[PDB]
Amino acid sequence: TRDQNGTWEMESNENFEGYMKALDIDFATRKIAVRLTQTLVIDQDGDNFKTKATSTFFNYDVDFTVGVEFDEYTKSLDNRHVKALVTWEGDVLVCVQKGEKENRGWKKWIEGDKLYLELTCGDQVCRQVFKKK
């Protein structure tokens, strides 16, 4: 399904450190972030997404429209300019963030009862699994 609506609670988080290191997130932020449970809130209506990722100490907002390129200033992460585009490849939602970092973006998809989020940067891949609240 393409329906990714809901409140999603983190089950697993594999190689978050490697992904964050590839982004040049500072040491101290990485050490805290890797231990925290994330909650993802996704409001999806047609092509319009409003999403939030939240933890005890960090929060990451991003809204986008599928198929509409948008500039991003990742000021809370690694503080870079990227040109972002989110599109569907089958039932996989694919974000490419064009900029300095190669292979930067993510892929989100539903498999049974779970939401998968694959974060990429450089040679690093982080795989997160969420289940609905």
Numbering used by the authors: 1 to 133
Excerpt from the paper describing this PDB structure:
Human cellular retinol binding protein II (hCRBPII) was used as a protein engineering platform to rationally regulate absorptive and emissive properties of a covalently bound fluorogenic dye. We demonstrate the binding of a thio-dapoxyl analog via formation of a protonated imine between an active site lysine residue and the chromophore’s aldehyde. Previously, we showed the utility of human cellular retinol-binding protein II (hCRBPII) mutants as a fluorophoric tag, wherein an active site lysine residue (Q108K) reacts with synthetic aldehydic chromophores, giving rise to the formation of either an imine (Schiff base, SB) or an iminium (protonated SB, PSB). Q108K functions as the active-site lysine and forms a Schiff base with the aldehyde, whereas the K40L mutation is assumed to eliminate interactions between Q108K and Lys40, an interaction that could otherwise impede imine formation, and is also required to promote Schiff base protonation.
Subsequently, our investigation aimed to alter the polarity of the Thr53 position, which makes a water mediated hydrogen bond with Thr51 in crystal structures where both residues are maintained. The T53A mutation also red-shifted absorption and emission, but far more modestly (5 and 3 nm respectively, compare M4 to M1). We next turned our attention to the entrance to the binding pocket because our previous studies with retinal showed that introduction of aromatic residues in this region leads to the closure of the binding pocket and results in substantial bathochromic shifts.
